[PDB]
RNA sequence: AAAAAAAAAAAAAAAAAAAAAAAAAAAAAAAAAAAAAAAAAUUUUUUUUUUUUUUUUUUUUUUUUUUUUUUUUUUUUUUUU
C-alpha cells in the first residue's frame, strides 16, 4: 500500500487486534517517533510486519505502548541509527527480533540489556561494526535460541563475546 | 758669663736607597664545577601521506544448469461444425 504515515488515532478502537501486517505500506515513514504506534496502546498485538517500509530512524520509546507485542519485523529496511537499548523500551514480553537486511546497525554494551527475554535474533546483511567492546552486548540476554550474524563481515570477536548464552542452539 | 777649632758620644725631626716578609687589587697558565646551548651515533614512539601481500562485504558483468509465465510457428493422432 501507499499510505504516507499513520496518525494519532488511525488504529484507535482495535481492542482485540493481535495480528497486524504493514509490509511495503508506508512511503513517508523515513523517521519513526514515539507518536506513530500510540493508537495501538490498547491493542494486544502479537505479530507486527513492517518490511519494505523504508524505515531509517526510530526514536526512543517508539514501541513503549507495545507491551504485549511478541513478533516484530523490521527487515528489508534502510535503518541508519545507533542502537542504545532504549529503542526497544516498553517490550515487556518480546519473543524474537527481525532486523536483518540493513546497511548500518552499530551495537553498544547496552543496546539489548533492556529486554533480556528474547528467543531468536538474526542480523543477516546489516553491516554491523564495533562489537569488540566489553562486556558483550549479548551478555544480559539469557533465552536466545537462534543467533545469526551472517553476511556482515565481522571484523573481530573476543573472548567476552557469546558469554553466558547457554540456551543458544542455532 | 760668652764665642769658637781638633777628638768623642749621641737623642729627636724631615728625607731617601736597599734586604726579609705580609695582607689587598689587577693579569695570565693549568685542575675542576653548575648550567641556558650545539651537533652525531645507536635505540625506538605518536601523527599525516602513500606502496605491496592476504581474508572477506556490497554493486556490476560473462557463461552453464534448473524452473515459472506473455507469445507462439508444428501437430503424428482423436471425436467434429
Ligand atoms: C518521544 O521522543 C521524544 C524525543 O526524544 C522525547 O522528548 C524528549 O523527552 C525527554 C524526557 O522528558 C526530554 O529530556 C528532558 O526533558 C525534561 C522535561 O521533561 C527537561 O526538564 C530536561 O531538561 C530534558 O530536556 C527531551 O528534552 C525531549 N526532547 C524532545 C525533542 O522533545 C519524548 O519524551 C518521547 N516520549 C516517550 C513517551 O518516549
Ligand atoms: C511479512 O510479510 C512478508 C510477505 O508475506 C513475509 O515474507 C515471507 O517471509 C518468509 C520467511 O522469511 C519467507 O519464507 C522463506 O522464504 C525464503 C526465500 O526468501 C525461502 O528460501 C525459505 O525456504 C522460506 O520459504 C517467505 O517466502 C516470504 N514471503 C514473501 C512473499 O516475501 C514476512 O515473513 C512477514 N514478516 C513477518 C511475518 O514477521
Ligand atoms: C535514547 O536513549 C539513549 C540511552 O539512554 C540515549 O543515549 C544516552 O545519551 C546521553 C546524553 O548524551 C549519554 O550521556 C552522556 O554520554 C556521553 C557520551 O556521548 C558521556 O561522555 C557522558 O559522560 C554522558 O554519559 C549516554 O551515555 C547515552 N547512553 C547510551 C547508552 O548511548 C539517547 O540520547 C536517547 N535519545 C533520545 C532522543 O532520547
Ligand atoms: C527464560 O526462559 C525460562 C524457561 O522458558 C523462563 O522461565 C519460565 O517463565 C515463565 C513465565 O515467567 C513460567 O511460566 C515458566 O514456568 C518458566 N519455566 C521454567 C522452566 O522455569 C524465564 O522466565 C525466561 N527468562 C525471562 C527473563 O523471561
Swiss-Prot record:
Highly expressed in lung. After intraperitoneal injection of lipopolysaccharide, highly expressed in brain, heart, kidney, liver, lung and spleen. It is found in: Endoplasmic reticulum membrane; Endosome membrane; Early endosome. It comes from the Eukaryota. TLR3 signaling requires a proteolytic cleavage mediated by cathepsins CTSB and CTSH, the cleavage occurs between amino acids 252 and 346. The cleaved form of TLR3 is the predominant form found in endosomes. Ubiquitinated by TRIM3; leading to recognition and sorting of polyubiquitinated TLR3 by the ESCRT complexes. Ubiquitinated by ZNRF1 via 'Lys-63'-linked ubiquitin chains; leading to TLR3 lysosomal trafficking and degradation. Glycans are attached at residues 34, 49, 60, 143. LRR repeats lie at residues 16-36, 44-65, 68-89, 93-114, 117-137, 143-164. ds-RNA binding is mediated by LRR 1 to 3, and LRR 17 to 18. Monomer and homodimer; dimerization is triggered by ligand-binding, the signaling unit is composed of one ds-RNA of around 40 bp and two TLR3 molecules, and lateral clustering of signaling units along the length of the ds-RNA ligand is required for TLR3 signal transduction. Interacts (via transmembrane domain) with UNC93B1; the interaction is required for transport from the ER to the endosomes. Interacts with SRC; upon binding of double-stranded RNA. Interacts with TICAM1 (via the TIR domain) in response to poly(I:C) and this interaction is enhanced in the presence of WDFY1. Key component of innate and adaptive immunity. TLRs (Toll-like receptors) control host immune response against pathogens through recognition of molecular patterns specific to microorganisms. TLR3 is a nucleotide-sensing TLR which is activated by double-stranded RNA, a sign of viral infection. Acts via the adapter TRIF/TICAM1, leading to NF-kappa-B activation, IRF3 nuclear translocation, cytokine secretion and the inflammatory response. Belongs to the Toll-like receptor family. This is Toll-like receptor 3. The gene is Tlr3. The chain holds residues 366 to 535 of 905 of the full protein.
